């Protein structure tokens, strides 16, 4: 099962709303998992089956979509958000998206 | 149940030769079969290596490295050990320990969402 994320870069301003896309090759029903990885470090687990957010996770930060079509929405876009996000399903075993660059301009 | 992943130093590898990247777990309760391997080559996504499956109790890897991949742990030391050998240039990447999530459900070719993540190893090969 192929994850194709989208936009390649989102370029957003401090208080804007950020709309990631996650396009599933098969159908994965809510098995999505939403990642942020902060330059040189590991990723941090943001939205789990889809919706649920993570342990210490601001509202800001919420996860939408089932079978194919996927959103991560970063509302109120803060300076410290600016990472590259993956995807990643559980459905069909382990497998992440490309990334989406956040810059914060 | 909040643990932390603790890597070893990065290493520059020439060709044909193998790496062994550690990883030690501190915190609540150490099991070899929720720490699981992966790693992310630079401009792409992270990629699934490998685990040490529970009742089997023996270690599985994907395709991609099998013939090549070792994995081992030593609960004792509450340690997972990587060893990715025959090295390509291909193999330059960070590679992670996570360990994983349990699902309310486990089912037919169904995996895992990683939680917590060690730090990262770059593996560098020339």
Not at chain 1, 39 to 58: E, F, V
Not at chain 1, 59 to 75: E, N, P, V, W, Y
């Amino acid at each position: 099962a192929e994850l194709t994320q989208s936009p390649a870069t989102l370029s957003l301003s401090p208080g804007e709303r950020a709309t990631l896309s996650c396009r599933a090759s098969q159908s994965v029903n809510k098995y999505l998992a939403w990642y942020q990885q902060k330059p040189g470090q590991a990723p941090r687990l943001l939205i789990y089956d889809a919706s649920n957010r993570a342990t210490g996770i601001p509202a800001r930060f919420s996860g939408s979509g089932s079978g194919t079509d996927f959103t991560l929405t970063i509302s109120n876009l803060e300076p410290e958000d600016f990472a590259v996000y993956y995807c990643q399903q559980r459905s069909d075993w382990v497998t992440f998206g490309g990334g989406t660059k956040v810059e914060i301009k | 149940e909040v643990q932390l992943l603790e890597q070893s130093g990065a290493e520059v590898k020439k060709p044909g030769s193998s790496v062994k990247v550690s990883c030690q777990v501190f915190g609540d309760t150490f099991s070899r079969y929720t720490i699981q391997w992966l790693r992310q080559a630079p401009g792409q996504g992270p990629e699934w290596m490998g685990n040490i499956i529970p009742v089997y109790n023996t270690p599985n890897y994907a395709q991609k490295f099998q013939g090549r991949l070792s994995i081992t742990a030593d609960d004792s030391t509450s340690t997972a050990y990587m060893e990715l050998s025959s090295l390509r240039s291909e193999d330059t990447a960070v590679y992670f320990c996570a360990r994983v999530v349990i699902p309310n459900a486990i089912r037919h070719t169904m995996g895992y969402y990683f939680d917590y993540w060690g730090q990262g190893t770059l593996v560098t090969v020339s």
